[PDB]
């Protein structure tokens, strides 16, 4: 199909789709809009939200729903039905935490305090659960990389902007990051993508 | 298989799974715990959250990942891969909303004003988007029922506890609720189930 991805010029919630197109070596239009474009772009969305992905003229929405669609019947999915369920569960566990953050808070001082509290008081319990889940295994699910490893790398990249020592007690979680980042199609995307804070 | 669901004695995040089991005619242990048992059980879960579902002695977690695992290869999944993406997308849109609500929050007026914010300003936008998305079709996705229809019924039920006028301008959304509640195995489950607030 012809693919058009619509999002801000940010990594954010589109980045998981971008990694999956990179890894799978699929061409697509990476359409990055400006704030000034938002009211106009918005009036065309089913639920007022981006990313969307248009596929031969038809609109998909919800970044995780899209990422799952793109990975079906590929090596990124999970080998078995049970591993597929595990892939989904780890992705939702990550997404639930990213969704706690007050991304749209106007007052900067209140936004900053709350980010600092989540990262200091809540994040270490999640990092420890993830570490323990991972064990000495090479990848989070099964024997080869899945889009849950991608998403771990993506989410921890953004958290590390706000909490640099996030992973100081979890060197196995750093290794996993580095393995995701050394996959050649993915290294290539990381090197060439627009550099944005988020 | 041998299925055991563990959740609180509420509909909450487990209800989607109970509707799936009911509709597919699958027997399972509906294990409901007490606040007082939680601290003890919690410390044994991979990520310290419920619901969990144990399948022949194996532990799955995350309610929507489990819901997807159970519906795969059934007529509750959509009929094409694109249609399965629209089912996951509707569910995520509804889950994103329900998740915005500060369920555990223990200050009655930060909680009580947040509920009013989402219920007064956000809800009507969502109800309007869903209605436009449905149009005059029978079901949200495709030509028959999917678990996105189940999630809408479940979500709108709890929303109606906090905002009984929610669906006043949206009679078609009410007709969808009733198409679902009319399905015999679902009807059977609704009368049979523990009566809880949430
Ligand atoms: N940057 C953002 C921003 S924001 O532009 O700064 O506002 C927002 C944001 N969430 C968000 C989710 C739902 C809503 S809604 N419509 O109310 O339901 C609004 C914002 C995320 C990110 C991420 O960067 C990100 C990175 C990795 C995983 C998840 C997220 C991520 O969830
Ligand atoms: N998105 C997850 C949410 C998991 C979750 O945070 N569940 C709550 C109850 S609805 C829980 O187990 N938390 C209680 C606690 O951690 O003390 C799911 O649907 O399974
Ligand atoms: Ca989510």
Hey, what domains does chain B have and what are their CATH numbers? 1-74+183-198 (3.40.30.10), 75-182 (1.20.1050.10)
* Chain B residues touching residue A88 (CB < 8 angstroms): 62, 64-65, 68-69
Q: Of A131, A29, A25, which is closest to residue A74 (Cα–Cα)? A: A25
Please give, rounded to a whole number of angstroms, the shortest distance from the CA of B181 to a CA of chain A: 25
Cβ < 6 A, ligand 1 pocket: A 10, 12-13, 49, 98-99, 103-104, 154-155, 158, 198; B 96
Please report, in angstroms and rounded to a whole number, the separation of the first and last CA atoms in chain A: 29
A150 HSE (CA, 13 A, CB side): 32
Atom from ligand 2 closest to the CA of residue B62: 20
Residues A152, A66, A27, A87, Cα dihedral to 10°? 40
Experimental method: X-ray
A103 noted as active-site residue: yes
**What HEC string does chain B produce?**
CCEEEEEECCCCCCHHHHHHHHHHCCCCEEEEECHHHHHHHHCCCCCCCCCEEEECCEEEECHHHHHHHHHCCCCCCCCCHHHHHHHHHHHHHHHHHHHHCCCCCCCCCCHHHHHHHHHHHHHHHHHHHHHHHHCCCCCCCCCCCCHHHHHHHHHHHHHHHHCCCCCCCCHHHHHHHHHHHHCHHHHHHHHHCCCCCC
Pick from A74, A48, A43: nearest CA to A61: A48
Nearest to A65 among B62, B89, B132 (CB): B89
Partners of residue A93 in chain B, C-beta under 8 Å:
47, 49, 61-62
């Amino acid at each position: 199909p012809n693919y058009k991805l619509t999002y801000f010029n940010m990594r954010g919630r589109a980045e998981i789709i971008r990694y999956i197109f990179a890894y799978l070596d699929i061409q697509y239009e990476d359409h990055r809009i400006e704030q000034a474009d938002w009211p106009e772009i918005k009036s065309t969305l089913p639920f007022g939200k981006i990313p969307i992905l248009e596929v031969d003229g038809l609109t998909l929405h919800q970044s995780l729903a899209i990422a799952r669609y793109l990975t079906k019947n590929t090596d990124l999915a999970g080998n078995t039905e049970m591993e597929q369920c595990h892939v989904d569960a780890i992705v939702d566990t990550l997404d639930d935490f990213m969704s706690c953050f007050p991304w749209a808070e106007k007052k900067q001082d209140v936004k900053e305090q709350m980010f600092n509290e989540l990262l200091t008081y809540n994040a270490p319990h999640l990092m420890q659960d993830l570490d323990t889940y991972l064990g000495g295994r090479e990848w989070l699910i099964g024997m080869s990389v899945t889009w849950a490893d991608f998403y771990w790398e993506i989410c921890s990249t953004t958290l590390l902007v706000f909490k640099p020592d996030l992973l100081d007690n979890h060197p196995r979680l750093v290794t996993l990051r580095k393995k995701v980042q050394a996959i050649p199609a993915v290294a290539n995307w990381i090197k060439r993508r627009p550099q944005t804070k988020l």
